[PDB]
Amino acid sequence: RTVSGVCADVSEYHPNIKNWQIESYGEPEFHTAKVHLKCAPGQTISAIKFASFGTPLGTCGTFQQGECHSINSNSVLERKCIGLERCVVAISPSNFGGDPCPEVMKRVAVEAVCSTAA
């Protein structure tokens, strides 16, 4: 029962920053941006409309390939999304397969399809 539609827009990020906490806490495990996806209680993700980890053009609503693509930005979604009411994927060069295009900014764009339980 198609009845939903979510899209997350994020951009790689991990500048050398050795200073971000002046309290009794610590968490040196965040050198990249994360994607936040989640549907209402009663619906489940079953398919991915688009997913690219390189230089996607357009915006949330009609993304589109640009020129550089890792030809593998869709195999990581079906493996870490479909089958869960919520989806979360960390963008990093250690979760996809090395680096895609060199000398090219890194922008992440994704789109999930939520409907109902199957």
87 touches 32 (CB < 8 A): no
Q: Structural domain boundaries of the chain?
A: 1-118
108 touches 91 (CB < 8 A): yes
Helix (H), strand (E), coil (C) string for the chain: CCCCCEEEEEECCCCCCCCCCCCCCCCCCCCCCEEEEECCCCCCEEEEEEEEEECCECCCCCCECCCCCCCCCCCCCCCCCCCCCEEEEECCCCCCCCCCCCCCCCEEEEEEEECCCC
Rounded CA-CA distance 53/108 in Å is: 5
